[PDB]
């Protein structure tokens, strides 16, 4: 997270860290045994880490559960990052309390101008490299379909929405991939891609989760 703040320990109780010996992506717990992430965050040997604040320190609220099954969306195009969504199932359910909680899926798509919360353990420098150990947060408005397509001509699909700041300085970044974009208590976006981080006229592009609620429900209902 570039240009954000320190969320606070377990102040985002649905955020997840995907560990393969090291934090490489984030996630969002949508129920006690399913995590939503980004398809480009796929790999074998994913251990899901819940209750995390400091990902290099065991503080005493973590839950380490290995994944049992990964499901990358049937239509995920790596080359355009269209349908950049995957489901991860936990080998055992999570113990749901105040610091490990699921996030509600959306019933309708969120609107441009709506203010969302973007969190992750990703890079904090737009021109540099520094990774945080504690969770970082950002509050960002969803940008209008027109300004999104103007910043990325020929790339933005109906399965993507831009959110952030066109003046540059505040964005999500490498390492926050697969993390939540929560608007009005719902999961509306997934950290997907973008040109650099926090650059002028190059905002963050996020997977439009409202377009995938039916897939998530019928996939969860059969696996
Ligand atoms: O984002 C672009 C994608 O849409 C495609 O064109 O492949 C190259 C990328 O720069
Ligand atoms: Ca920890």
From Swiss-Prot:
Domain Peptidase S1, first and last residues per copy: 1-221
Coiled coil: none
Keywords of this entry: Calcium, Digestion, Disulfide bond, Hydrolase, Metal-binding, Protease, Secreted, Serine protease, Signal, Zymogen
Active site, renumbered: 40 (charge relay system), 84 (charge relay system), 177 (charge relay system)
GO terms for cellular component: extracellular space; serine protease inhibitor complex
Main location per the UniProt record: secreted
Cofactor section: Ca(2+)
Binding-site list for substrate: 171-172, 174-175, 177
Family statement: Belongs to the peptidase S1 family.
Protein name: Serine protease 1
Origin organism lineage: Eukaryota, Metazoa, Chordata, Craniata, Vertebrata
Gene label: PRSS1
